[PDB]
Amino acid sequence: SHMCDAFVGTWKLVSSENFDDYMKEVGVGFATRKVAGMAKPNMIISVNGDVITIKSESTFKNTEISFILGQEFDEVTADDRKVKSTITLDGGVLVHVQKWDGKSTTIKRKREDDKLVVECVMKGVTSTRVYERA
Numbered sequence: 001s002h003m004c005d006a007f008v009g010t011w012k013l014v015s016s017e018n019f020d021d022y023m024k025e026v027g028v029g030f031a032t033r034k035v036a037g038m039a040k041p042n043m044i045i046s047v048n049g050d051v052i053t054i055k056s057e058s059t060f061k062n063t064e065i066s067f068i069l070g071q072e073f074d075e076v077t078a079d080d081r082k083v084k085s086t087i088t089l090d091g092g093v094l095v096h097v098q099k100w101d102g103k104s105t106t107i108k109r110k111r112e113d114d115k116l117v118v119e120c121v122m123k124g125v126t127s128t129r130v131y132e133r134a
């Protein structure tokens with residue numbers, strides 16, 4: 001319990017850096033990159049017992065994942081990859097690893113001041129996405 005208290009809430013994207021290049025590195029095609037890159041999603045994080053839910057309400061694609069820390073699950077990403085995901089807590093950072101087609105990407109989510117900072121890494125390419133409370 002209380003494991004993710006500081007993550008819970010409704011968050012809105014306020015800034016992004018290098019997201020197009022991250023998406024390229026992931027293999028996202030041109031048209032999806034353009035439409036995905038415009039979006040300013042709402043990320044809604046909640047906890048009920050051991051189950052964490054992360055919803056994204058977006059003009060591009062709505063998604064919802066529910067999971068237990070350390071327990072692999074199936075995820076269809078907003079860009080339509082069918083991945084196997086595992087999310088753990090490492091030193092207060094949510095670490096989300098996605099595996100598909102022999103590839104891997106990691107999404108880290110951390111609280112920094114009044115922000116929720118999302119770092120997306122594919123090989124040598126990082127994108128930083130900053131969310132504030134909605």
Ligand SMILES: O=c1cc(O)cc(CCc2cccc3ccccc23)o1
Nearest residue numbers: 023026028036078079107118120129
């Ligand atoms: O938790 C968050 C918040 C973010 O801002 C970004 C991401 C990375 C996953 C993602 C989300 C939505 C669209 C995408 C399109 C292409 C590739 C990955 C995508 O996760």
